[PDB]
Symmetry: none
Subunit: 24 residues, 15 copies
């Protein structure tokens, strides 16, 4: 369904799903 594929990415990754009110 949901596929996250990161290759040598610079920075954080945010694949969070269906979470209630994320605050960063």
């Amino acid at each position: 369904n949901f596929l996250v594929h990161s290759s040598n990415n610079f920075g954080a990754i945010l694949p969070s799903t269906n979470v209630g009110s994320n605050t960063y």
Copy 2:
């Protein structure tokens, strides 16, 4: 369905889906 493919990207990635009111 949803496919995220990042190759040597510079910056954060935001694939978050169906989350309620994301605040960054």
Copy 3:
């Protein structure tokens, strides 16, 4: 369903799902 694949990523990874009100 939900697949997280990170290759030599620089930064934290946030695959948290269905959590209530994450605060970082």
Copy 4:
């Protein structure tokens, strides 16, 4: 269902799911 695969990632990993009000 939920699959976390991290290869030589630099930083902490946050796969926490269904937790109530995580505070870091």
Copy 5:
């Protein structure tokens, strides 16, 4: 269901699930 696979990761790992109000 929930699968955590970390290969030579640098940093702590947080797979905690259904815990009440984690404070770190």
Copy 6:
């Protein structure tokens, strides 16, 4: 000299790559 950040949220890559002069070779 002093520097800080109060409530910033940097979602990416910062590449200063600073180096001190070395006169190599």
Copy 7:
């Protein structure tokens, strides 16, 4: 000289890669 951070949240990679001059070789 002094530096700090109070409530910052850095979600990424910082690459200063500083080095002192060494005059190698």
Copy 8:
């Protein structure tokens, strides 16, 4: 000289990779 951090939360990689000048070889 003094430095600290009070309530910071660094979610990533910091790569200063500092080194002192060594004049090797």
Copy 9:
């Protein structure tokens, strides 16, 4: 010289990799 941290929470990797000059070889 003095340094400390009061309430910081470092969730990652810090790579200073400092070394003293050695003049090897």
Copy 10:
């Protein structure tokens, strides 16, 4: 010189890898 930490919580890896100059070989 003196250094300490009061209430810090380091959730990761710190890699100073310091070494004293040795002039080997």
Copy 11:
């Protein structure tokens, strides 16, 4: 290295000091894949 595929390199009196770069330093390959 004859009659068959081969790769070789020779270096002497060498120095390299490069800033942050997303690749190997002076790499060489005949047919292989550099997917690091």
Copy 12:
């Protein structure tokens, strides 16, 4: 390196100091793929 495909390099008295660049430093390849 004859009668078959080959790649080779020779260097001496070399110095390189390049700013942040998205590729290898002085790479060479005959047929291979640089997908780093």
Copy 13:
């Protein structure tokens, strides 16, 4: 290294001092995969 595929390298009087880089230092491969 003849009549069959081979890889070889020779180095002497060498020095390398590179800043943070996302790859091996002076690597060489004939057919293999560098997936580190």
Copy 14:
């Protein structure tokens, strides 16, 4: 190393001092996989 695939390296009078890098130092492989 003839009539069959082989890998070899020879080094003398060598020094290496590299900053933090995400790969082996002067590695060589003919066919193998570097997945460290």
Copy 15:
């Protein structure tokens, strides 16, 4: 090392002093896997 696959290395008068790196120091492999 002939008529069969083989790997070999020879070194003398060697010194290595590398900063923190995520890989072996001067490793060599013909066909094996480096998954450390």
